[PDB]
Amino acid sequence: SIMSYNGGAVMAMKGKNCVAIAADRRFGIQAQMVTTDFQKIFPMGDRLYIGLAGLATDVQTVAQRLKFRLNLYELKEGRQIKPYTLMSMVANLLYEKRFGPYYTEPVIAGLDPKTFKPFICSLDLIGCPMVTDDFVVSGTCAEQMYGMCESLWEPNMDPDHLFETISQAMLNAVDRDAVSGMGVIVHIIEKDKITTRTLKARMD
Amino acid sequence: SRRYDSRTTIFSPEGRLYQVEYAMEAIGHAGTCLGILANDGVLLAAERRNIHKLLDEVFFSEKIYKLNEDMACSVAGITSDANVLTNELRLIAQRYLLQYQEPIPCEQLVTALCDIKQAYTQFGGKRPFGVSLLYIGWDKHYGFQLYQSDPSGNYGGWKATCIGNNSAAAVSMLKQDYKEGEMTLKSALALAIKVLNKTMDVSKLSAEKVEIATLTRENGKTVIRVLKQKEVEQLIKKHE
Amino acid sequence: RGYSFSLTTFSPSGKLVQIEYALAAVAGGAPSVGIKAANGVVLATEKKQKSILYDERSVHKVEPITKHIGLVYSGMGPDYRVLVHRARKLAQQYYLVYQEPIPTAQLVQRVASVMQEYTQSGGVRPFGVSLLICGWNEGRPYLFQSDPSGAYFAWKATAMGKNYVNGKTFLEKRYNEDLELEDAIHTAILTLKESFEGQMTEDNIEVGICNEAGFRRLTPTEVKDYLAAI
Amino acid sequence: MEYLIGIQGPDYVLVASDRVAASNIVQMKDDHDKMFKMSEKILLLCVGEAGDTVQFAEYIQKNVQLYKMRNGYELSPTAAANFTRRNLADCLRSRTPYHVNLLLAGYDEHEGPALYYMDYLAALAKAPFAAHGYGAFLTLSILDRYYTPTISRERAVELLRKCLEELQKRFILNLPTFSVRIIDKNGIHDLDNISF
Amino acid sequence: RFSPYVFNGGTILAIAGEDFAIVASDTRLSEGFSIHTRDSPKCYKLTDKTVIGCSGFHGDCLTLTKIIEARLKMYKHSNNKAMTTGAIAAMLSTILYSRRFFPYYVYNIIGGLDEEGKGAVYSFDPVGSYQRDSFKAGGSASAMLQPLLDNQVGFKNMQNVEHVPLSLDRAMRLVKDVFISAAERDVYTGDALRICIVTKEGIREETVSLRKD
Amino acid sequence: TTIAGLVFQDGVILGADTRATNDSVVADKSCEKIHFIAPKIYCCGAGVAADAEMTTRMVASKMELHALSTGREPRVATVTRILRQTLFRYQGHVGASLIVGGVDLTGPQLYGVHPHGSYSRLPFTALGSGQDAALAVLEDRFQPNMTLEAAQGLLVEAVTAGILGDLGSGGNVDACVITKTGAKLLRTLSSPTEPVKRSGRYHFVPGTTAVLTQTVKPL
Amino acid sequence: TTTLAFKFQHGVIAAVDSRASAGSYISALRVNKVIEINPYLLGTMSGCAADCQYWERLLAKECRLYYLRNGERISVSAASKLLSNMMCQYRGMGLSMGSMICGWDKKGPGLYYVDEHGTRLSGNMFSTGSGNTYAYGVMDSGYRPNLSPEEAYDLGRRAIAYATHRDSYSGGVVNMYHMKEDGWVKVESTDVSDLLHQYRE
Amino acid sequence: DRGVNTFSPEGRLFQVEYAIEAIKLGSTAIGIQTSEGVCLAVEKRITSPLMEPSSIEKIVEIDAHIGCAMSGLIADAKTLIDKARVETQNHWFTYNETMTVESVTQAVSNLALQFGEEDADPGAMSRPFGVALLFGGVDEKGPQLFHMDPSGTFVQCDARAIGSASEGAQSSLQEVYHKSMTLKEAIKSSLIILKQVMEEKLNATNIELATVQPGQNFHMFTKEELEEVIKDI
Amino acid sequence: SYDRAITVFSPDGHLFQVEYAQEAVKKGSTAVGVRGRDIVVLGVEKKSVAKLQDERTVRKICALDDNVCMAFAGLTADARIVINRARVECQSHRLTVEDPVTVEYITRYIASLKQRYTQSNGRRPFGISALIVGFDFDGTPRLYQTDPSGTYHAWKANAIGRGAKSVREFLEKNYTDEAIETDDLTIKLVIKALLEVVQSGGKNIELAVMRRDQSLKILNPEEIEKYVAEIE
């Protein structure tokens, strides 16, 4: 599997006008933990984060090209990108490499710029945009996160319960994986503030 | 066929590129534009020609474009060519941010563009861009900066300068009234409204006949802001 | 192969003489009028119709570009067809790439760019049309005027073609910011009616409206109704 | 084989490498240098398939020098690392896949020292210390046992000789002498080559 | 899997004396387990001083000789003089190497007279890589003819033997007797012998019969 | 992914499941498949989801542009033609097994265009992994000139048989009734499954999560 | 083939054997393996022959163009580096070229190794080819930078000698040059087996 | 205005006539062919004492046996010189022999009338070379001196004067030359004619001199050798 | 593409575009250099004092490498192009040779480039004369002048730009081995030269300095002004 060459899994989640994006922090070659502060959740606006996963070079390359097209958009436009626009952009970008695909499985989490409606979406490594309403995951340890999220998620959770849910989701979900973990980062995206939180994960 | 070629890339009998100097005539007829370099920020002040009619003012400003996180540019003369140049600068600076993961300094950006304008001025036979540009932008090497470029591709750093209509009277007033290294942002506002008051012969200056956007530093981030109309009336009234 | 040098050269005074002349050509075009209401935009343009032989319903000057954008011109027709097909191409590229209706300020930026490319390329003359692009989105009206030189102006209400100066002076005294859409259409049709010279009918003046429901042409029945009460 | 290593303390970066360029059984050269001086304050450490190292890394060296001669100043080490990252990524899928593992140790006047890692798939990752080759599998746990964020450069060299003595004891390949350079606000300091 | 090379056999031979250069080859053009023709001489008169052999994949022998002769008239046009054996040797090295990645599979052996009237023989390989020898065999039967030409021409492993210069006749009987020694044993050699002698007088041609079975 | 079609007296009607797997795991529960092509021409999507999306979206743009060009309704022959030339140019790599349907001036036409380019007009069809069950029931109960109600219940029997009888096709069925008058996207026609509730609340009071590092940024 | 070269007080001597073997068969056994580029350059050869002949001859063509343009007699650095670029262009195309560029430039005796991959190495002692390792062994135990030219030559003959003694793909006669300050001079083209009998008794 | 490829009413390209007039403004160079070899001397025409005399090199090497004197637009002849160098060296690589003089002057002569303004796949040459070369050298055919001009016609000449005062000087060449001439006599004679033609007073600085003999390679006479030969004046 | 032949002969053999480009140089800001024992100094006249002006970005004395710097005069934009091409080519030379470029290499390069644009389709000649000064790896000083025609030369000390006739007359008169025995006599030679043509003794050219195996050294206008009073 080329995808699990670096490992790492990121999920988002939807709640009370706030969507929380998580990620693990283990940049590792196959079995060798190399770094514990590798960035996977790249901001794309005041309230819009695009968490990527997979092979490292496609993480950073997709993030940087996307930030290219996004600064061109915001400059050439008069406006920050709406989350649905950003989704169609990233889907276009992964799909331009249809036969040489970036091994990145992004999930985009954020708010409407004006109305501040929560938004998420996950994509596959060729760009099948799959907007959802409860959550998304991505990366080498997707399954454990489907279990923990599908069991822990509930309709209409305010920010704090959201941080509890996504907290335990990432913790339990990565501890049962070898190629991920080494800490966890979490972002709550409210209407007015943005809280960054790292978590105490097993360091082994 | 050779009857039709205007030969826009040849010297004259005295060594003067006729198309570049004619372009300098066109920008010479454009609306005046001037900014000032200070210690706490930089401001641009451009006479608008969208003066006044049934225009809508759908945009935030007329002659001020935003180039990256940390820069701003003012054009003068051919509006369309100014559009092409602005789009090209955005493309350059964003390619630099792709290929280096940092903002592009003003000097590198201006040089990248001025190589383009020079390129048209040399071969290809196309007409040169008749669009002069004043830039303002901060970079962690050299601080606040002002770059004037003209159709010939030549550019220079300035502390305050004015391009366009009555540019001579404007630069004259700056020579008489610029205190090097001691002009504050507000001192820059007052002086700029001074020069624009004296130069713009259309006669009583309004908030509608100019716009001013200022750039400063705030909390490790650069702020590019345009002056709302109330502040413009306030600063002209203060000028009275 | 074709000429590669620009045909538009800075005259020794520095004013691009070909764009002066092209603007004179648009100045001779058939009169057009656009006005922006509070909830939409009106477009009404004069049919310089020759002999009654013409199938007037065969071609229209006010063509939609998507479900929410229009166009009227003033001057050379075929050139206008060029810019229409180019605009439809651009809005479709934008819709494929971003999955959103193209904001009218954008589309006018690109089409303005395409109008600029020919003031500078090899062996082509500038266009001879001055577009009026009306558009609606974000719950807001837009009305831009592009010229042969490529620059575009955002307008409350405007006029172009034959006698555009008296048209604009006619709008300065008769446009008010709170004008609803239908009374806007009345004001525009009066504006053309100042210098029509020919007793307008529902066949020889076109009327376009862009509001929240989208852009479209008013059938000559409805335009006949608005041609009532005048 | 080839073993890089780099540690990043308060105000420096103490990179070390091995000095062997082998051919399938025999050390053809025991005075080879794997550290390519980018600029006044930037070392580039390249290891891997032969030909890719010299060609690629000298390409990067020439682009950086070109930048300094174009603009009168040097790339900040973040910029250089993301630059080499650009070329190696853009060449990852291209006609010429360069199979080089890097560490672009650097010190900036402003941001301070930083030690960028890079596997051969263009994965960039700032780290307080790194390694390469099979010797990484025997040293990185040692650095973890002895590293501290406030380590002094003398203590750094002591640590580094603990790692390298571990290679001479346990690792299987004859790696006799190691290059070791330090980088601080005063530039590069070619320190004494460690031998055994 | 389409295979673009087939071994059409047939051995050549070349010897250099003090004033001449013989070139010889069998004209059996074999393939698989048959005999296409018992006549296809593998020496091609290039100039008045240069007789080039070709064995191996017969198609590339044809194409390669045709390209060589075309290059000779190109040279003669741009320089007003026929290529010597030296130039033909080097040029055939760059021809044979410019296809380094899909070779001409043709063992050339260019024998002829350099500008000093002395013998010279440039044995090649399919990818370039030439040299000047005093004698050489190539092709199918090179391994059975090479050692005997070491013996009666190179005089190696002898004791108390005068290394007399190679006379044209004794070179002849060496050529014919060695090709008989190959015809007895090599399957691909036989059915004829095309011996071309090179001297300042021109190129005289001599043929010999061999085993047909 | 089990999409089907049908043709009755007045017009066509397209079915679709609402699930999309990731190699063993039901990724989505409410993915749409009856995409948009023209104001009355809809295109269902089976196979590689990304390629059906991209293909049908591109062709959607060409039919919109064309539709403004000719000043007319788009004809489904055009849509199928551009779809199968686009699919054919790539030599079947773009595994997007569309089933395009619509209503022209000629009448209701339900084409089916496979990944290599082979299209085939026909009165009823069903693509996707559950094409077995859908083809089964459509074969068994189809009739020329059906009532739109009998068409709706029939197609729901079909895509239903795909839902229950297949693994990689589940969730809710979506049927879109197209007629000469216009299109009505009857989203989530039937919902066989009911498992939406539960009986175990899994809540952790704030503080049960061991947080190491923190930061807050006002906006 | 076994090819070695080392440098000492009095220049650089490069010794090469003279057998060229097509697989298991000995094609020719008095081959000249050391292409002489300039009056005082010297590049050996190894591996597939045609690559060394073509690319190193072409290297001589580059050096001649340089010497005509700048008139300053291209140095060893530019030589090995330029051949390094000719090889690095066709990376992984199958070129089997292991060679060495001996010479004498302004900085002194510059001995370089240029590999098929692009490996490029200055150095004191080299030994390439199929039997390089033996030449390593017999050179090192018996190398010291204070050797006179005589002891140097005998050391070479011992090196290439035993290197072709234990090896299958190496033999014939030993060429051995002496890259002095004013250019090379061919020191010998000696038979090998006769040497091994002079060394066995 | 007209094109570059226009034939006049007389039948010559304009650009080749005006170009062959442009060569008439260059500094006079002269070389002579003898059975011992061929010499080449050219007036530098120093403009100021601030100049480096060894800078102006109008007699440059094309290979070990071909010395290329020139006159005219000295800038243009750089492409010719480099063209010839790449030619003879590629000839050596491919064919393993030195390249004849006729082959070189023919190859480099192929570039003169390679100029135009409509074919132009690259930005190829937009005017004829304003260079008059005089390739000198020795081959198996022996000493030969091939004139060349902008029109691309390369002709064998026994001795030829090219440049500003080529008219009179050439009269001196037909006046003095004879087949049995010895090479030192060639050097002396040519320096005599240059001294006739030059404006400035002659010395060993504002000229150069090279020869190519059957066994000697191309060689430029240094200051002392030039002085030793000018002692005869 | 534009492929008209801009530079064509005229009815005297003259290339009028080249004479016109040299006209553009003759209106350029006057520059001068000199070649000393271990130092090489360049002076660029004043150019555009303009009290609001920025000094740093309006100089005429750019760096081409560690050992090669250059003045010029004329169309400053064009000279920016030539400077850039020469820089990229210097670094490509270090890539393909490992040896820093001799001054002869880079100068003969740029002379080749200017020669090509004198002779290609749709391209005007550069209006720049470049006095590239530098140090060969042996450390000898190097002054090469390159004009729009493309012909380049070594020079003891030559002046380019407007009024280069009178200034060149100056170095013809005052360049002596006593003149360049030391540094300060050299630099007072350069500024003593331009002072015939500078706008009142100045700032109003400041200059530049390069020492053997030492990177380019510039001057601020104070140390320029010391020499100013020292010569005035």
Ligand SMILES: CC(C)(C)NC(=O)C[C@H](NC(=O)CCc1ccccc1)C(=O)NCCNC(=O)c1cccc(-c2ccccc2)c1
């Ligand atoms: C004696 C003569 C003059 C005929 N050449 C061959 O047989 C050359 C000999 N070359 C071949 O059989 C070609 C085999 C081949 C068949 C099909 C496709 C590609 C290659 C060869 O070299 N075989 C071992 C690899 N190369 C070497 O071992 C080698 C190493 C150093 C020097 C030389 C060398 C180079 C030039 C002249 C002499 C020797 C060869």
